[PDB]
Design a protein around this ligand. Structure first.
Ligand SMILES: OC[C@H]1O[C@@](CO)(O[C@H]2O[C@H](CO)[C@@H](O)[C@H](O)[C@H]2O)[C@@H](O)[C@@H]1O
Ligand SMILES: OC[C@H]1O[C@@](CO)(O[C@H]2O[C@H](CO)[C@@H](O)[C@H](O)[C@H]2O)[C@@H](O)[C@@H]1O
Ligand code: NI
Ligand code: NI
Lengths: 329, 329
């Protein structure tokens, strides 16, 4: 989107989970944008009561100017649960409700009614148990957006890793890396660093696939046959790319500090460092969608729902990042 | 070895490299053990001159009591270079000398003449160019020790990762993990944590091979078919093992803090986090050898030889770890 307004939509997600707690907790401070929470209002107020935190919900008025959200409030875009919610207890009765809040939030983000979509956790199993096709937010938003390719990034305030491949068995990773696949992934990554993170000339640092980036062909051939040629084609199109580098070189701070994003070839090459340094404030950012979407990188934490022990760090950081992307855009 | 004396052998390694600088720099403080440096004495004194640091070499007297090394000195076990050494310039003429210092140091560590072997960097190419079979210190010491299996560990003062597999292309990793291979690797790892690190009941935490440790068979089958059964056999023999866990769970500090060592299944699953947090003070420790051996985790840094800019952190930490292993043993 070339223009962004001053309203963000938040879906708390699974009502039995901690998303509601976390939304209510986020709401105890002032924000520079309007926080439009798509959720059941009774739930939020009752969860706020269970946690002993105050909360006033303001009706969402689409035709009004955004009002920067004030401490002790949220702006509600009300959607009703079908059944009573009991914290910690999944109930198939409320899955239509969860997915409805996603649909609404996604439709808004698409049109630009909402400047960014920030998501709390949902539970795939209970959604499926209600007969609704669902894997994650990513596929639901991609399909509803008619978005043909997305790229996963995990990011903290200080470090961004994107993945060339995601939830594949290790056996399948080398075959899944092609020149075509890397072309698509890096184009999206470079495009969003510019358009979403507002970095005019992103420096993207790339991991080899093999240990020591293949050590001259002595420890694998994928760097020579596939990665290097793909990067060179992209550099011809103007994308600033350094690598491929050994992962255990690149992930030293002395080099990391130079990267705007790192592209890991596979899940466990990239995520461990981020989680190590993340202090539980890591944020999932879905690239390639036609709008800004950030997310918590934890689950529903059902056992912690309504306890006051759920950590708000991921959600606060997700919302913080969203807001910078709205602006640095 | 059931008993350790108060003498450590240091091989500075490649004379044209930074190993000599680093040895001379280590020597500017007091140590609780005797530091027997197997190297050319003219080289060390000349490198000390180039770096403007003082240095007195004490002749090594095997039949005397160890004397705790004093600041401004080393104990020399002299071995002559064949040709003049020029910092930064590899010379095939001196490779026989490098390998001779390794042989001597290794023979001593074997017999218990030396309580631990700590190695500076060597350069494989120049050793090979002189017609001498060489890959690394590890294979040279393993073969000379008649040691049938070694396990690589990278460790800092705060975190230890061992690897189930090392310098293999990613394609080869899943096939290289067997019940047999994991049995051998974990036996060695557990044995050395007890005998070398002095941890009576090591808690070893194990990564799955696949992302999310295979997610119940939905993201790979190796955890179910191979890893889990291997760990259960080992737990029957009394080895305390937690996992397999997702790498991007396990490498969070909140869980790491509980592990005495982490076993990563492959190189890039384990090393990046260690290097990230290592601040360049990471130490390679070779497990399974019949003596304690620690090492720098950097190369010869030829361009930095005699500049005073080479970082001593890895070497200081390597020597520090060696000394604790001598004692905690
Ligand atoms: O040993 C590293 C190995 O990685 C490659 C890429 O596959 O090169 C990387 O490392 C080089 C420094 O060792 C850099 O000059 C290069 O730009 C970087 O891509 C291989 O060529 C090399 O053998
Ligand atoms: O999703 C994790 C995945 O890993 C396995 C091992 O392959 O189990 C690990 O994680 C469980 C918690 O989710 C622990 O109970 C277990 O001890 C640990 O090994 C799989 O069983 C699971 O599907
Ligand atoms: Ni994942
Ligand atoms: Ni390596």
């Amino acid at each position: 989107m070339h223009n962004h307004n001053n309203r963000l939509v938040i879906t708390p997600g699974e009502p039995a989970g901690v998303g509601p707690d976390l939304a209510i907790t986020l709401a105890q401070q002032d924000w520079p944008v309007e926080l439009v929470v798509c959720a059941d209002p009774a739930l939020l107020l009752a969860r706020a009561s269970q946690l002993n935190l105050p909360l006033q919900l303001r009706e969402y008025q689409a035709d009004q100017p955004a009002i920067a959200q004030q401490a002790g409030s949220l702006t509600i875009l009300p959607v009703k649960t079908a059944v009573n919610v009991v914290p910690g207890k999944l109930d198939v009765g409320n899955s239509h409700y969860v997915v409805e809040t996603l649909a609404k939030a996604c439709d808004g983000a698409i049109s630009g009614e909402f400047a960014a979509l920030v998501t709390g956790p949902v539970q795939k199993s209970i959604i499926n148990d209600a007969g609704i096709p669902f894997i994650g937010h990513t596929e639901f938003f991609a399909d509803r957006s008619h978005c043909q390719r997305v790229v996963m990034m995990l990011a903290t305030e200080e470090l961004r890793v994107a993945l060339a491949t995601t939830h594949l068995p290790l056996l399948a990773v080398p075959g899944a890396i092609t020149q075509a696949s890397l072309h698509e992934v890096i184009t999206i990554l470079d495009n969003d660093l510019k358009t979403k993170f507002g970095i005019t000339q992103p420096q993207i640092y790339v991991c080899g696939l093999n240990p020591h980036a293949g050590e001259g062909g002595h420890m694998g051939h994928e760097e020579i046959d596939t990665i290097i040629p793909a990067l060179n084609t992209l550099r011809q199109q103007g994308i600033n790319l350094i690598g491929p580098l050994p992962a255990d070189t690149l992930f030293q701070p002395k080099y990391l500090q130079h990267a705007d994003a790192v592209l890991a070839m596979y899940h466990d090459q990239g995520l461990p460092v981020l989680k190590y340094q993340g202090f539980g404030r890591a944020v999932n950012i879905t690239l390639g969608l036609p709008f800004i979407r950030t997310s918590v990188d934890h689950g529903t934490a059902l056992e912690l729902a309504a306890t006051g022990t759920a950590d708000v760090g991921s959600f606060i950081t997700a919302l913080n990042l969203a807001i910078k992307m709205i602006n640095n855009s």
